[PDB]
mmCIF file of all heavy atoms in Angstrom:
data_model
loop_
_atom_site.group_PDB
_atom_site.id
_atom_site.type_symbol
_atom_site.label_atom_id
_atom_site.label_comp_id
_atom_site.label_asym_id
_atom_site.label_seq_id
_atom_site.Cartn_x
_atom_site.Cartn_y
_atom_site.Cartn_z
ATOM 1 N N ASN K 1 76.809 88.760 74.439
ATOM 2 C CA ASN K 1 76.403 89.475 75.636
ATOM 3 C C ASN K 1 75.079 90.197 75.458
ATOM 4 O O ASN K 1 74.998 91.411 75.596
ATOM 5 C CB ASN K 1 77.482 90.463 76.056
ATOM 6 C CG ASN K 1 78.724 89.775 76.577
ATOM 7 O OD1 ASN K 1 78.747 89.285 77.706
ATOM 8 N ND2 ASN K 1 79.765 89.741 75.765
ATOM 9 N N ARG K 2 74.037 89.437 75.154
ATOM 10 C CA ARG K 2 72.699 89.992 75.025
ATOM 11 C C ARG K 2 72.006 90.095 76.369
ATOM 12 O O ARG K 2 72.514 89.610 77.371
ATOM 13 C CB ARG K 2 71.852 89.148 74.082
ATOM 14 C CG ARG K 2 72.305 89.162 72.651
ATOM 15 C CD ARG K 2 72.133 90.549 72.071
ATOM 16 N NE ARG K 2 72.450 90.582 70.650
ATOM 17 C CZ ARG K 2 71.567 90.338 69.690
ATOM 18 N NH1 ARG K 2 70.313 90.059 70.005
ATOM 19 N NH2 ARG K 2 71.932 90.383 68.418
ATOM 20 N N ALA K 3 70.847 90.742 76.374
ATOM 21 C CA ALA K 3 70.022 90.834 77.565
ATOM 22 C C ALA K 3 69.652 89.442 78.033
ATOM 23 O O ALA K 3 69.346 88.571 77.232
ATOM 24 C CB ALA K 3 68.781 91.646 77.283
ATOM 25 N N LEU K 4 69.686 89.238 79.341
ATOM 26 C CA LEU K 4 69.594 87.901 79.901
ATOM 27 C C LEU K 4 68.544 87.857 80.993
ATOM 28 O O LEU K 4 68.242 88.876 81.604
ATOM 29 C CB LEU K 4 70.950 87.478 80.452
ATOM 30 C CG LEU K 4 71.101 86.093 81.072
ATOM 31 C CD1 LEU K 4 70.896 85.047 80.019
ATOM 32 C CD2 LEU K 4 72.460 85.941 81.700
ATOM 33 N N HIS K 5 67.980 86.684 81.244
ATOM 34 C CA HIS K 5 67.047 86.569 82.353
ATOM 35 C C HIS K 5 67.121 85.208 83.021
ATOM 36 O O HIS K 5 66.908 84.186 82.389
ATOM 37 C CB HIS K 5 65.627 86.843 81.870
ATOM 38 C CG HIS K 5 64.598 86.760 82.950
ATOM 39 N ND1 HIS K 5 64.601 87.590 84.048
ATOM 40 C CD2 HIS K 5 63.521 85.956 83.091
ATOM 41 C CE1 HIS K 5 63.578 87.295 84.825
ATOM 42 N NE2 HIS K 5 62.905 86.307 84.268
ATOM 43 N N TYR K 6 67.436 85.203 84.307
ATOM 44 C CA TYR K 6 67.489 83.969 85.079
ATOM 45 C C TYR K 6 66.250 83.756 85.913
ATOM 46 O O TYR K 6 65.640 84.716 86.368
ATOM 47 C CB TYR K 6 68.705 83.964 85.989
ATOM 48 C CG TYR K 6 68.704 82.848 87.000
ATOM 49 C CD1 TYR K 6 68.978 81.553 86.625
ATOM 50 C CD2 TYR K 6 68.433 83.096 88.328
ATOM 51 C CE1 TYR K 6 68.985 80.534 87.541
ATOM 52 C CE2 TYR K 6 68.438 82.082 89.253
ATOM 53 C CZ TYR K 6 68.719 80.803 88.852
ATOM 54 O OH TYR K 6 68.727 79.782 89.769
ATOM 55 N N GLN K 7 65.882 82.498 86.131
ATOM 56 C CA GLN K 7 64.797 82.223 87.060
ATOM 57 C C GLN K 7 64.759 80.790 87.551
ATOM 58 O O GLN K 7 64.784 79.863 86.758
ATOM 59 C CB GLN K 7 63.469 82.548 86.402
ATOM 60 C CG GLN K 7 62.289 82.472 87.326
ATOM 61 C CD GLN K 7 61.017 82.844 86.617
ATOM 62 O OE1 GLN K 7 61.036 83.194 85.443
ATOM 63 N NE2 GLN K 7 59.910 82.780 87.320
ATOM 64 N N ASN K 8 64.669 80.610 88.861
ATOM 65 C CA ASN K 8 64.395 79.291 89.414
ATOM 66 C C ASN K 8 62.900 79.070 89.449
ATOM 67 O O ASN K 8 62.172 79.823 90.084
ATOM 68 C CB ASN K 8 64.981 79.145 90.814
ATOM 69 C CG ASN K 8 64.899 77.725 91.334
ATOM 70 O OD1 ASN K 8 64.126 76.911 90.843
ATOM 71 N ND2 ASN K 8 65.703 77.424 92.339
ATOM 72 N N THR K 9 62.440 78.026 88.772
ATOM 73 C CA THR K 9 61.015 77.781 88.627
ATOM 74 C C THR K 9 60.392 77.104 89.837
ATOM 75 O O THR K 9 59.173 77.010 89.937
ATOM 76 C CB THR K 9 60.735 76.919 87.402
ATOM 77 O OG1 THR K 9 61.407 75.664 87.548
ATOM 78 C CG2 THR K 9 61.245 77.612 86.163
ATOM 79 N N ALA K 10 61.217 76.616 90.749
ATOM 80 C CA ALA K 10 60.700 75.985 91.951
ATOM 81 C C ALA K 10 60.011 77.008 92.841
ATOM 82 O O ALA K 10 59.174 76.659 93.662
ATOM 83 C CB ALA K 10 61.803 75.291 92.701
ATOM 84 N N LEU K 11 60.380 78.272 92.675
ATOM 85 C CA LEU K 11 59.840 79.356 93.480
ATOM 86 C C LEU K 11 58.811 80.139 92.686
ATOM 87 O O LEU K 11 57.751 80.495 93.190
ATOM 88 C CB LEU K 11 60.957 80.283 93.930
ATOM 89 C CG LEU K 11 62.104 79.690 94.742
ATOM 90 C CD1 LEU K 11 63.168 80.740 94.933
ATOM 91 C CD2 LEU K 11 61.638 79.172 96.076
ATOM 92 N N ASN K 12 59.154 80.416 91.437
ATOM 93 C CA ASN K 12 58.290 81.126 90.507
ATOM 94 C C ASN K 12 58.108 80.362 89.215
ATOM 95 O O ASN K 12 58.824 80.592 88.250
ATOM 96 C CB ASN K 12 58.832 82.511 90.196
ATOM 97 C CG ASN K 12 58.475 83.527 91.244
ATOM 98 O OD1 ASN K 12 57.350 84.028 91.265
ATOM 99 N ND2 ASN K 12 59.421 83.851 92.120
ATOM 100 N N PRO K 13 57.142 79.442 89.198
ATOM 101 C CA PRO K 13 56.870 78.533 88.084
ATOM 102 C C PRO K 13 56.544 79.239 86.772
ATOM 103 O O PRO K 13 56.808 78.691 85.711
ATOM 104 C CB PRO K 13 55.661 77.743 88.579
ATOM 105 C CG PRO K 13 55.011 78.637 89.543
ATOM 106 C CD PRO K 13 56.127 79.318 90.251
ATOM 107 N N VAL K 14 55.939 80.413 86.842
ATOM 108 C CA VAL K 14 55.500 81.098 85.635
ATOM 109 C C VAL K 14 56.507 82.123 85.141
ATOM 110 O O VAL K 14 56.594 83.218 85.676
ATOM 111 C CB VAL K 14 54.161 81.794 85.862
ATOM 112 C CG1 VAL K 14 53.737 82.534 84.620
ATOM 113 C CG2 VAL K 14 53.118 80.780 86.262
ATOM 114 N N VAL K 15 57.273 81.761 84.119
ATOM 115 C CA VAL K 15 58.191 82.701 83.496
ATOM 116 C C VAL K 15 57.423 83.784 82.741
ATOM 117 O O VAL K 15 56.466 83.484 82.038
ATOM 118 C CB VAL K 15 59.143 81.984 82.538
ATOM 119 C CG1 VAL K 15 60.025 82.978 81.821
ATOM 120 C CG2 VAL K 15 59.984 80.984 83.296
ATOM 121 N N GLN K 16 57.858 85.032 82.874
ATOM 122 C CA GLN K 16 57.203 86.158 82.220
ATOM 123 C C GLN K 16 58.209 87.036 81.521
ATOM 124 O O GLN K 16 58.993 87.715 82.170
ATOM 125 C CB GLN K 16 56.420 86.989 83.227
ATOM 126 C CG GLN K 16 55.215 86.294 83.789
ATOM 127 C CD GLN K 16 54.543 87.104 84.857
ATOM 128 O OE1 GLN K 16 55.178 87.918 85.518
ATOM 129 N NE2 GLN K 16 53.250 86.899 85.029
ATOM 130 N N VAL K 17 58.189 87.037 80.194
ATOM 131 C CA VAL K 17 59.205 87.774 79.451
ATOM 132 C C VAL K 17 58.612 88.610 78.340
ATOM 133 O O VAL K 17 57.819 88.115 77.553
ATOM 134 C CB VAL K 17 60.242 86.820 78.846
ATOM 135 C CG1 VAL K 17 61.109 87.544 77.859
ATOM 136 C CG2 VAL K 17 61.098 86.221 79.927
ATOM 137 N N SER K 18 59.003 89.876 78.266
ATOM 138 C CA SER K 18 58.549 90.728 77.181
ATOM 139 C C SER K 18 59.666 90.982 76.178
ATOM 140 O O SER K 18 60.779 91.337 76.544
ATOM 141 C CB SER K 18 58.010 92.046 77.731
ATOM 142 O OG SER K 18 57.545 92.875 76.687
ATOM 143 N N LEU K 19 59.354 90.790 74.907
ATOM 144 C CA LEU K 19 60.325 90.935 73.839
ATOM 145 C C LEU K 19 60.079 92.233 73.094
ATOM 146 O O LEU K 19 59.015 92.408 72.497
ATOM 147 C CB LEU K 19 60.237 89.743 72.896
ATOM 148 C CG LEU K 19 61.204 89.696 71.723
ATOM 149 C CD1 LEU K 19 62.620 89.605 72.229
ATOM 150 C CD2 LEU K 19 60.882 88.505 70.854
ATOM 151 N N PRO K 20 61.065 93.140 73.118
ATOM 152 C CA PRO K 20 61.043 94.515 72.608
ATOM 153 C C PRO K 20 60.964 94.615 71.097
ATOM 154 O O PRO K 20 60.821 93.611 70.411
ATOM 155 C CB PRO K 20 62.365 95.084 73.106
ATOM 156 C CG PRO K 20 63.234 93.928 73.222
ATOM 157 C CD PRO K 20 62.368 92.828 73.722
ATOM 158 N N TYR K 21 61.062 95.833 70.586
ATOM 159 C CA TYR K 21 60.859 96.067 69.169
ATOM 160 C C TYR K 21 62.066 96.732 68.540
ATOM 161 O O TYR K 21 62.137 97.950 68.451
ATOM 162 C CB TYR K 21 59.608 96.920 68.957
ATOM 163 C CG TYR K 21 59.326 97.283 67.521
ATOM 164 C CD1 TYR K 21 58.817 96.349 66.640
ATOM 165 C CD2 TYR K 21 59.540 98.564 67.060
ATOM 166 C CE1 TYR K 21 58.553 96.680 65.335
ATOM 167 C CE2 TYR K 21 59.281 98.903 65.759
ATOM 168 C CZ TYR K 21 58.785 97.959 64.902
ATOM 169 O OH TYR K 21 58.526 98.301 63.602
ATOM 170 N N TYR K 22 63.026 95.922 68.122
ATOM 171 C CA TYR K 22 64.176 96.441 67.413
ATOM 172 C C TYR K 22 64.043 96.191 65.925
ATOM 173 O O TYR K 22 64.442 95.142 65.436
ATOM 174 C CB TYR K 22 65.470 95.803 67.913
ATOM 175 C CG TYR K 22 65.792 96.066 69.361
ATOM 176 C CD1 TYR K 22 65.661 95.076 70.310
ATOM 177 C CD2 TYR K 22 66.297 97.281 69.761
ATOM 178 C CE1 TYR K 22 65.977 95.310 71.622
ATOM 179 C CE2 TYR K 22 66.604 97.527 71.071
ATOM 180 C CZ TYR K 22 66.449 96.539 71.994
ATOM 181 O OH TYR K 22 66.770 96.786 73.303
ATOM 182 N N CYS K 23 63.465 97.138 65.201
ATOM 183 C CA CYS K 23 63.488 97.076 63.748
ATOM 184 C C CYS K 23 63.862 98.420 63.167
ATOM 185 O O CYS K 23 63.506 99.456 63.719
ATOM 186 C CB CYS K 23 62.136 96.636 63.198
ATOM 187 S SG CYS K 23 61.693 94.954 63.616
ATOM 188 N N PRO K 24 64.600 98.409 62.057
ATOM 189 C CA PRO K 24 64.908 99.610 61.290
ATOM 190 C C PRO K 24 63.676 100.341 60.773
ATOM 191 O O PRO K 24 63.691 101.563 60.675
ATOM 192 C CB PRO K 24 65.742 99.062 60.135
ATOM 193 C CG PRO K 24 65.345 97.649 60.029
ATOM 194 C CD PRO K 24 65.142 97.206 61.419
ATOM 195 N N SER K 25 62.627 99.599 60.445
ATOM 196 C CA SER K 25 61.463 100.185 59.794
ATOM 197 C C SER K 25 60.306 100.430 60.736
ATOM 198 O O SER K 25 60.059 99.655 61.647
ATOM 199 C CB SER K 25 60.999 99.290 58.660
ATOM 200 O OG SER K 25 60.560 98.049 59.166
ATOM 201 N N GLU K 26 59.574 101.512 60.483
ATOM 202 C CA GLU K 26 58.435 101.882 61.303
ATOM 203 C C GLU K 26 57.305 100.861 61.224
ATOM 204 O O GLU K 26 56.490 100.761 62.133
ATOM 205 C CB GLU K 26 57.918 103.259 60.891
ATOM 206 C CG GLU K 26 58.880 104.394 61.198
ATOM 207 C CD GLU K 26 58.345 105.749 60.764
ATOM 208 O OE1 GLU K 26 57.338 105.784 60.028
ATOM 209 O OE2 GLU K 26 58.910 106.782 61.177
ATOM 210 N N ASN K 27 57.261 100.112 60.131
ATOM 211 C CA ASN K 27 56.215 99.122 59.923
ATOM 212 C C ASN K 27 56.786 97.772 59.567
ATOM 213 O O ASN K 27 57.909 97.675 59.099
ATOM 214 C CB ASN K 27 55.272 99.559 58.813
ATOM 215 C CG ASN K 27 54.421 100.733 59.201
ATOM 216 O OD1 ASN K 27 54.169 100.969 60.377
ATOM 217 N ND2 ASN K 27 53.968 101.483 58.210
ATOM 218 N N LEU K 28 56.000 96.730 59.784
ATOM 219 C CA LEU K 28 56.363 95.383 59.376
ATOM 220 C C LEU K 28 55.202 94.667 58.738
ATOM 221 O O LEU K 28 54.187 94.434 59.385
ATOM 222 C CB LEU K 28 56.837 94.567 60.562
ATOM 223 C CG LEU K 28 58.183 94.867 61.185
ATOM 224 C CD1 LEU K 28 58.299 94.100 62.474
ATOM 225 C CD2 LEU K 28 59.257 94.425 60.222
ATOM 226 N N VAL K 29 55.338 94.307 57.472
ATOM 227 C CA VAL K 29 54.355 93.436 56.860
ATOM 228 C C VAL K 29 54.431 92.108 57.602
ATOM 229 O O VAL K 29 55.514 91.671 57.971
ATOM 230 C CB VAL K 29 54.608 93.274 55.356
ATOM 231 C CG1 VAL K 29 55.958 92.673 55.114
ATOM 232 C CG2 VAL K 29 53.542 92.417 54.735
ATOM 233 N N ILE K 30 53.288 91.485 57.867
ATOM 234 C CA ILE K 30 53.271 90.283 58.689
ATOM 235 C C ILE K 30 54.014 89.157 57.982
ATOM 236 O O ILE K 30 53.897 89.006 56.770
ATOM 237 C CB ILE K 30 51.856 89.811 59.000
ATOM 238 C CG1 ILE K 30 50.962 90.975 59.398
ATOM 239 C CG2 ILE K 30 51.893 88.927 60.211
ATOM 240 C CD1 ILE K 30 51.373 91.645 60.639
ATOM 241 N N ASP K 31 54.759 88.368 58.745
ATOM 242 C CA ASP K 31 55.648 87.342 58.198
ATOM 243 C C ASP K 31 56.599 87.934 57.160
ATOM 244 O O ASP K 31 56.784 87.378 56.082
ATOM 245 C CB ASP K 31 54.856 86.196 57.575
ATOM 246 C CG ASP K 31 55.740 85.030 57.183
ATOM 247 O OD1 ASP K 31 56.917 85.020 57.599
ATOM 248 O OD2 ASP K 31 55.293 84.157 56.414
ATOM 249 N N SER K 32 57.176 89.085 57.469
ATOM 250 C CA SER K 32 58.175 89.672 56.590
ATOM 251 C C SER K 32 59.439 88.834 56.583
ATOM 252 O O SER K 32 59.838 88.300 57.613
ATOM 253 C CB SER K 32 58.504 91.096 57.025
ATOM 254 O OG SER K 32 59.496 91.661 56.181
ATOM 255 N N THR K 33 60.066 88.711 55.422
ATOM 256 C CA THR K 33 61.351 88.034 55.323
ATOM 257 C C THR K 33 62.427 88.984 54.828
ATOM 258 O O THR K 33 63.540 88.571 54.526
ATOM 259 C CB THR K 33 61.288 86.832 54.385
ATOM 260 O OG1 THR K 33 62.514 86.095 54.468
ATOM 261 C CG2 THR K 33 61.073 87.292 52.960
ATOM 262 N N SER K 34 62.085 90.263 54.744
ATOM 263 C CA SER K 34 63.008 91.263 54.235
ATOM 264 C C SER K 34 64.098 91.577 55.250
ATOM 265 O O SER K 34 65.084 92.228 54.927
ATOM 266 C CB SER K 34 62.257 92.535 53.853
ATOM 267 O OG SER K 34 61.614 93.098 54.979
ATOM 268 N N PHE K 35 63.910 91.117 56.480
ATOM 269 C CA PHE K 35 64.887 91.361 57.527
ATOM 270 C C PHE K 35 65.277 90.068 58.217
ATOM 271 O O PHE K 35 64.738 89.726 59.261
ATOM 272 C CB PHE K 35 64.351 92.360 58.543
ATOM 273 C CG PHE K 35 64.086 93.709 57.966
ATOM 274 C CD1 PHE K 35 62.802 94.109 57.660
ATOM 275 C CD2 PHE K 35 65.125 94.587 57.740
ATOM 276 C CE1 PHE K 35 62.560 95.357 57.133
ATOM 277 C CE2 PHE K 35 64.888 95.834 57.208
ATOM 278 C CZ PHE K 35 63.604 96.218 56.908
ATOM 279 N N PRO K 36 66.219 89.335 57.612
ATOM 280 C CA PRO K 36 66.671 88.017 58.061
ATOM 281 C C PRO K 36 67.237 87.985 59.475
ATOM 282 O O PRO K 36 67.083 86.980 60.161
ATOM 283 C CB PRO K 36 67.761 87.671 57.051
ATOM 284 C CG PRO K 36 68.250 88.985 56.578
ATOM 285 C CD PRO K 36 67.028 89.831 56.494
ATOM 286 N N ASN K 37 67.882 89.061 59.904
ATOM 287 C CA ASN K 37 68.593 89.043 61.179
ATOM 288 C C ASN K 37 67.820 89.565 62.374
ATOM 289 O O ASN K 37 68.427 89.929 63.376
ATOM 290 C CB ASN K 37 69.890 89.835 61.066
ATOM 291 C CG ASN K 37 70.958 89.080 60.328
ATOM 292 O OD1 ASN K 37 70.954 87.852 60.291
ATOM 293 N ND2 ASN K 37 71.892 89.811 59.732
ATOM 294 N N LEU K 38 66.498 89.626 62.284
ATOM 295 C CA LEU K 38 65.722 90.095 63.425
ATOM 296 C C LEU K 38 65.938 89.184 64.619
ATOM 297 O O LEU K 38 66.160 87.987 64.462
ATOM 298 C CB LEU K 38 64.239 90.185 63.086
ATOM 299 C CG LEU K 38 63.915 91.257 62.054
ATOM 300 C CD1 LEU K 38 62.450 91.232 61.709
ATOM 301 C CD2 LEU K 38 64.317 92.626 62.570
ATOM 302 N N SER K 39 65.912 89.765 65.809
ATOM 303 C CA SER K 39 66.191 89.019 67.023
ATOM 304 C C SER K 39 65.141 87.954 67.280
ATOM 305 O O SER K 39 63.963 88.135 66.989
ATOM 306 C CB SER K 39 66.278 89.956 68.220
ATOM 307 O OG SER K 39 65.028 90.568 68.461
ATOM 308 N N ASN K 40 65.590 86.835 67.829
ATOM 309 C CA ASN K 40 64.738 85.693 68.067
ATOM 310 C C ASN K 40 65.091 85.095 69.411
ATOM 311 O O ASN K 40 66.256 85.018 69.779
ATOM 312 C CB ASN K 40 64.901 84.665 66.950
ATOM 313 C CG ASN K 40 63.889 83.550 67.031
ATOM 314 O OD1 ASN K 40 63.298 83.300 68.079
ATOM 315 N ND2 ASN K 40 63.681 82.868 65.913
ATOM 316 N N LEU K 41 64.075 84.673 70.146
ATOM 317 C CA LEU K 41 64.258 84.228 71.513
ATOM 318 C C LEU K 41 64.839 82.821 71.579
ATOM 319 O O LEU K 41 64.583 82.004 70.704
ATOM 320 C CB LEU K 41 62.924 84.288 72.243
ATOM 321 C CG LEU K 41 62.967 84.008 73.729
ATOM 322 C CD1 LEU K 41 63.750 85.118 74.373
ATOM 323 C CD2 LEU K 41 61.571 83.939 74.288
ATOM 324 N N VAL K 42 65.611 82.546 72.625
ATOM 325 C CA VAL K 42 66.074 81.200 72.944
ATOM 326 C C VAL K 42 66.145 81.037 74.443
ATOM 327 O O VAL K 42 66.382 81.997 75.174
ATOM 328 C CB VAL K 42 67.463 80.878 72.365
ATOM 329 C CG1 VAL K 42 67.426 80.814 70.853
ATOM 330 C CG2 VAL K 42 68.480 81.888 72.843
ATOM 331 N N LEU K 43 65.953 79.811 74.902
ATOM 332 C CA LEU K 43 65.973 79.538 76.323
ATOM 333 C C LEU K 43 66.729 78.267 76.602
ATOM 334 O O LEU K 43 66.629 77.307 75.851
ATOM 335 C CB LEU K 43 64.547 79.443 76.861
ATOM 336 C CG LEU K 43 63.559 78.401 76.340
ATOM 337 C CD1 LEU K 43 63.731 77.054 77.011
ATOM 338 C CD2 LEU K 43 62.147 78.908 76.533
ATOM 339 N N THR K 44 67.493 78.259 77.685
ATOM 340 C CA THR K 44 68.256 77.069 78.018
ATOM 341 C C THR K 44 68.292 76.793 79.502
ATOM 342 O O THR K 44 68.478 77.697 80.315
ATOM 343 C CB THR K 44 69.721 77.161 77.543
ATOM 344 O OG1 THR K 44 70.347 78.305 78.137
ATOM 345 C CG2 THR K 44 69.816 77.268 76.028
ATOM 346 N N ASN K 45 68.099 75.530 79.851
ATOM 347 C CA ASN K 45 68.590 75.035 81.114
ATOM 348 C C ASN K 45 70.076 74.837 80.922
ATOM 349 O O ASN K 45 70.523 74.574 79.813
ATOM 350 C CB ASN K 45 67.907 73.731 81.511
ATOM 351 C CG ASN K 45 68.242 73.305 82.922
ATOM 352 O OD1 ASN K 45 69.204 73.790 83.514
ATOM 353 N ND2 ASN K 45 67.454 72.388 83.464
ATOM 354 N N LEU K 46 70.855 74.960 81.984
ATOM 355 C CA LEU K 46 72.237 74.543 81.898
ATOM 356 C C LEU K 46 72.213 73.020 81.869
ATOM 357 O O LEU K 46 71.236 72.423 82.318
ATOM 358 C CB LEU K 46 73.055 75.080 83.065
ATOM 359 C CG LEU K 46 74.536 74.732 83.001
ATOM 360 C CD1 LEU K 46 75.133 75.341 81.745
ATOM 361 C CD2 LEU K 46 75.262 75.213 84.237
ATOM 362 N N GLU K 47 73.251 72.412 81.296
ATOM 363 C CA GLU K 47 73.391 70.959 81.133
ATOM 364 C C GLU K 47 72.594 70.478 79.916
ATOM 365 O O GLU K 47 72.752 69.343 79.470
ATOM 366 C CB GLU K 47 72.973 70.204 82.404
ATOM 367 C CG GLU K 47 73.189 68.707 82.374
ATOM 368 C CD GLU K 47 72.772 68.039 83.666
ATOM 369 O OE1 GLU K 47 72.284 68.751 84.570
ATOM 370 O OE2 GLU K 47 72.923 66.803 83.778
ATOM 371 N N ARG K 48 71.767 71.363 79.372
ATOM 372 C CA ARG K 48 71.177 71.160 78.052
ATOM 373 C C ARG K 48 70.277 69.914 77.999
ATOM 374 O O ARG K 48 70.252 69.185 77.012
ATOM 375 C CB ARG K 48 72.315 71.075 77.024
ATOM 376 C CG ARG K 48 71.943 71.069 75.551
ATOM 377 C CD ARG K 48 73.203 70.870 74.737
ATOM 378 N NE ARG K 48 73.799 69.572 75.026
ATOM 379 C CZ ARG K 48 75.062 69.248 74.759
ATOM 380 N NH1 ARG K 48 75.871 70.137 74.203
ATOM 381 N NH2 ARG K 48 75.515 68.039 75.059
#
């Protein structure tokens, strides 16, 4: 039950999504691997 976003592209072709900042640490070394479970985006049409 994560945050969700629906959109019909026939009306609004340009999807616009902002991805927030959930990290334990105030800083992130670029391409850090110290935090394996960081949130990652996924998108699906139904029927796959």
Side-chain angles (χ1 to χ4, degrees):
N1 290 284
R2 293 294 185 88
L4 181 65
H5 181 62
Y6 169 75
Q7 187 178 358
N8 189 341
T9 60
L11 302 173
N12 278 281
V14 178
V15 176
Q16 291 175 334
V17 168
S18 181
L19 181 63
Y21 177 75
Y22 298 107
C23 294
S25 64
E26 293 179 348
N27 290 335
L28 288 170
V29 60
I30 316 296
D31 188 12
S32 179
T33 188
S34 61
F35 297 102
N37 284 335
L38 293 177
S39 65
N40 189 340
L41 187 66
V42 293
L43 60 83
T44 58
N45 189 343
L46 183 61
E47 185 179 2
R48 189 184 63 199

